[PDB]
Design a protein around this ligand. Structure first.
Ligand SMILES: NC(=O)c1ccc[n+]([C@@H]2O[C@H](COP(=O)([O-])OP(=O)(O)OC[C@H]3O[C@@H](n4cnc5c(N)ncnc54)[C@H](OP(=O)(O)O)[C@@H]3O)[C@@H](O)[C@H]2O)c1
Length: 315
């Protein structure tokens, strides 16, 4: 099952999340991406930041080599990291990602975040106070460079991530705009359901892609351990019991029924296989209303590191 993007390409509505924290050996991404493909995932979400494109790319190539899939069956996403927003750095960044993954093109290239950072060696250049050293870049210029990447065939589609409505509007209203973003990949789950942003995106034919749809990996770098654990929510657990599914499946299905494309990260073989069951059942209107009632403006990613950034999208 796919949705048609505003540039004519097609995106599978369920995607595999590949990020794992640095404490996880790099080789694991190879193993789990192959498992994901074997389970039925075709949309695979990576990024320069993840330090895994070589392993994820190898998994894709391996599954093409053994005849399981063809390149055209896979929808591969990468993302431009924030130290590469200056327009002259965009195509080189994409070319580096392609080289790592050993792919001729990405299906989707995203601006990972609107929060531009100082260019250089470090992924996350930080001051002595812990905050990231910011760069002030007109993102419309970054976008123009993204458009050139699509015209060159390096990316089939281009989009953004972590943009709010105002930031999207800035791109959409850019004079001489050639390609609208096909999507906005954002934090989205029952505790932070982004309903207003979703309505806006639908009105502009921009797909909303949900990350942390299962409540995030709760990494101590960015997430308060006090934050309620999404999958422990009693409404989600009651719905799981009602449907004889799992809280994760309820959370994924919720997104699909709102017209949101949903990612799901798992590095566990059993959970990877479980997550594809999202297509096997439905939630009723009353179920959906119960889940909508959980909305509580809880973005799990919530750190000083970026809450002070001039382009921080949340308010
Ligand atoms: N654009 C961005 O700024 C951004 C930000 C965050 C995420 N992302 C993308 O979105 C992906 C997913 O988001 P996320 O990394 O925050 O994780 P997530 O999809 O919210 O998953 C959170 C945790 O759920 C667990 N899980 C998965 N399936 C489960 C199941 N069926 N039952 C119980 N637990 C389950 C996983 O643990 P196990 O691995 O142990 O199964 C995982 O660590 C990322 O990997 C990345 O590709 C993008």
């Amino acid at each position: 099952q796919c949705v048609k993007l505003n540039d004519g390409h097609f995106m599978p509505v369920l995607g595999f999340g590949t990020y794992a924290p640095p404490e996880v050996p790099r080789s694991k991404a190879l193993e789990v991406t192959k498992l994901a493909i074997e389970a039925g995932f075709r949309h695979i979400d990576s990024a320069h930041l993840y330090n895994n494109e070589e392993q994820v790319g190898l998994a894709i190539r391996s599954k093409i080599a053994d005849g399981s899939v063809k390149r055209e069956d896979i929808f591969y996403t990468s993302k431009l990291w924030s130290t590469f927003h200056r327009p002259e750095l965009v195509r080189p960044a994409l070319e580096n990602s392609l080289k790592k993954a050993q792919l001729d093109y990405v299906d989707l290239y995203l601006i990972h975040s609107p929060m531009s950072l100082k260019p250089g060696e470090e992924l996350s250049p930080t001051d002595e106070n812990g905050k990231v050293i910011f760069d002030i870049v007109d993102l419309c210029t970054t976008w123009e460079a993204m458009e050139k990447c699509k015209d060159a065939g390096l990316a089939k589609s281009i989009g953004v991530s972590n943009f709010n409505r105002r930031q999207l509007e800035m791109i959409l209203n850019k004079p001489g705009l050639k390609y609208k973003p096909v999507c906005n990949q954002v934090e989205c789950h029952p505790y932070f359901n982004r309903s207003k942003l979703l309505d806006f995106c639908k009105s502009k034919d921009i797909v909303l892609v949900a990350y942390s749809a299962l409540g995030s990996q709760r990494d101590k770098r960015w997430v308060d351990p006090n934050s309620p654990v999404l999958l422990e929510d009693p409404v989600l657990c009651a719905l799981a019991k009602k449907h004889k599914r799992t809280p994760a499946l309820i959370a994924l299905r919720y997104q699909l029924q709102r017209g949101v494309v949903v990612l799901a990260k798992s590095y566990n073989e059993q959970r990877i296989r479980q997550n594809v069951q999202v297509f096997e059942f439905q939630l009723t209107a009353e179920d959906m209303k119960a889940i909508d009632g959980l909305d509580r403006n809880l973005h799990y990613f919530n750190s000083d590191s970026f809450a002070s950034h001039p382009n921080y999208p949340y308010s």
